[model samples]
Target: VSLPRMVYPQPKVLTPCRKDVLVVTPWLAPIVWEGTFNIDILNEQFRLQNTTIGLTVFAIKKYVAFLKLFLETAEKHFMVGHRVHYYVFTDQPAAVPRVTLGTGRQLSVLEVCERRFLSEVDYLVCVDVDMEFRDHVGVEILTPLFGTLHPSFYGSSREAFTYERRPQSQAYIPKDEGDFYYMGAFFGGSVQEVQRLTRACHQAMMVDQANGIEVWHDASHLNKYLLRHKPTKVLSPEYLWDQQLLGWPAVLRKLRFTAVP
Candidate 1:
């Protein structure tokens, strides 16, 4: 599908879009920040292709209660004009709130361990149910593969990152090694890429289990995987923030998705 002629401010080459932070990683993947992309252009490009995005969230047990606010806020800020499918996994399906969605949006409720991917979905966004969308999180984040930076470690040195240190565990990453500390709360990619990451992480956890070793958790395994494969894009901490714990920092120009205190 071809896109329409769009009008917008010209991007200046000599002038940097973001001067305060590292816009591109050493591997050349874009590190998404507030001033890094134009949402209008991204929206048009993705919409022209009729892209469909799936957002999966687990709300098992007491977590199901947060679905109301999560879904409500998501409707306001997550992929506003795109085709969106919300997959809610919960122990009690009846507990899942009936939140109204936009015209092209839909929601499906499934048992906690059940899984499925819509054939029409171009991208899959996996996030925690306890969080809420505070700002626009749209097609700009759609990539071949992407991981969000952990809010707690975005500014910390590699040595100080809480990556699994024990070599016996499959999640181990030496102190001197690491590109970024990716959080498990929010991450996504093309359906195939997301599947590959989750599969690999599950296998790594199994290997550690066989060795009778316990690592930090899924997030640690995620960091280990990204270290080797390297994501196509690295999301800034703004995508996965904690307003209460790490108040409003000068570096974070926007707090898109935040944790529930």
Candidate 2:
């Protein structure tokens, strides 16, 4: 059943706010070519609510080595000075890195899928393990729902997006249906909302699986999913980038989280 759309606040270019501001910035949110967000004010707001954020990632087999760098960089940049729970989902849980996090933070090593995390955190941030933080990515990004612009396709028109094109797949999207191609690597929201997205994507993936058809794999379904559900906030490309491929353009002030070599 389609959900009754919750009345979200109109885009508040001004913020300094719960009711007055949208949790996530609206679609086509701009990337700051340079600057830093106020960590002090944002931290106090969340502390009042006692927000518990869960960070989810998967590192199977050789990919586990990436966890150390991912976690260390996250400790330095991502959501610093907040109550955070790191959820590491790996085939080899023992191999997970033991990064020391600050107080009001903790870690949970999970040997399961990402959807199960819905029950665990107030907000969930699902990210790829093979990445590192290059700059600040803190409290400003804690939205009700969000998707980052895929680094490669951020500037591409909808026609050029790698959406699931085959009608046979539940993830299918026509050439005209896309808003932005959201990366499969970084997406999350409040627990209930994140669970909703994952459940929908998982179901779509299964349907395509049975048909012996796959659509752009997982990322394609994510694009199609957001096309309909709509992200509460769409992140700037800086939030999800690949420096090795895209490099530092003056348009990107900071490369917050970037792909590993």
What is the C-alpha local distance difference test score of each model?
A: 0.90, 0.77
List runs of model 2 lying over 4 Å from the truth: 1-39, 112-119
Candidate 1: deviation at residue 256, Å? 0.9
Q: Which tens-of-lDDT digit does each residue in 1-261 have in candidate 2? A: 333344444545684333422223355443222233445555767767778889988888899999999999988987777778898888998888778988888888878544555555788888989899989887677777778888898778999988888888898899877877889878888888887888898998898889898645879888888888877777777888888898887667678999899
Instruction: Give TM-scores for every candidate, taking all chains together and pairing residue i with residue i.
Output: 0.96, 0.84
What lDDT score goes with residue 155 in model 1? 84
lDDT of 1 by residue, 1-261 (tens): 676788888999999978999999998999999999999889999988899999999998899989999999999999999999998888999988888888999998888622357475889999999999999898888999999999988888999989999989899999999988888768899898989989999999999999998846988999999999999998999899989999999998899999997
Worst 10 residues of 2 by lDDT: 16-25
RMSD of 1: 1.5
